[PDB]
Amino acid sequence: EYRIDRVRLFVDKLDNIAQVPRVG
Amino acid sequence: EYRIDRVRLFVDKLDNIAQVPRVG
Amino acid sequence: EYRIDRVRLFVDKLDNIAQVPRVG
Amino acid sequence: EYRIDRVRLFVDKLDNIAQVPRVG
Amino acid sequence: EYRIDRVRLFVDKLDNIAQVPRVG
Amino acid sequence: EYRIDRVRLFVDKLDNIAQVPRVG
Amino acid sequence: KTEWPELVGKSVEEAKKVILQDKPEAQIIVLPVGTIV
Amino acid sequence: KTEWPELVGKSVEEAKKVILQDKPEAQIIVLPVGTIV
Amino acid sequence: KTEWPELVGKSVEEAKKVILQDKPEAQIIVLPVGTIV
Amino acid sequence: KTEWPELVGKSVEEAKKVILQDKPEAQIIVLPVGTIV
Amino acid sequence: KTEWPELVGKSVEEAKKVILQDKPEAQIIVLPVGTIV
Amino acid sequence: KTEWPELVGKSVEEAKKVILQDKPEAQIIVLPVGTIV
Q1: Domain locations along chain I
Q2: Is the Cβ of G36 closer than 8 Å to some Cβ of chain H?
Q3: What subunits touch chain L, counting only 3 or more CB pairs under 8 A?
Q4: Burial E1-24 (b: 16+ CB within 10 A, else e)
């Protein structure tokens, strides 16, 4: 489902952003 | 099994709804 | 292995039955 | 690796044997 | 995404580096 | 990556060696 | 009423309270995103 | 009695008590949804 | 503004504060790297 | 004695005690159901 | 300097300190072995 | 000395002590059974 207002954050074991955040 | 009275909630690491809830 | 006397319960994060229990 | 003296126990969330133990 | 400034560390159960760290 | 000086230990839920340790 | 798009990002509690209002007989299942169904 | 559709959404305790009533010899296994069998 | 490359390596808090500044209506979802979407 | 069907549903302790009685040289490995072997 | 073979087996702390010395702009990501990238 | 079949079933500590005796330069990695390598 592409949701224009959602931003998923993929975090590492220390809760640091692991990948470039993008809307969707 | 499609169950008309079940609603699965898929939660993120902070227990926020990650995806649109639907019956089934 | 189909075991006539076993009943697997598949539980959610809150330990509620998520799927219809069946013998096997 | 088939090891004649090993017995793997596959446990459920409550640590009860879920499947028939076999050597191997 | 190849990111020239990122270094992923893949850790074992004791948090020791398990694999050769590389940029990317 | 075959590393002649690495030894991976694959542990069970009780931290007992589950499989034959080998270099690599 | 088979979907709740307005619940994306809200907590489980808020979501539970909304769905039960719209669907009193709902059986609420809470799973980690990515659980293979 | 091979299935319990009426147990969807109930706790493990309630479910255990129901199944043992209907099937005294049951061996109850509790797994996370999505465990590949 | 659909991507934040400058946030790689920063904490969730810092990231939340940056995205909400640029996109006030964002619904922030926090998942483990590798979660199959 | 290569299998213990009578142990399905019993605890790890009970199971350990049974197998060691029948097979003194057993190396007991305890894994989560679904661990890919 | 794109790889650190000499860091296999060392702790995350030691590894962090080594990489930052050689690559001051590094964004250090710590994941469990086996995380599908 | 590339394998230790005699270590199946022993604890990580015992295993560490055995391998370091036979292979002083070993880099010991401890992973859950089933970790995809």
Answers
A1: 1-37
A2: yes
A3: D, E, F, J, K
A4: eebeebbbbbbbbeebbbbebebe
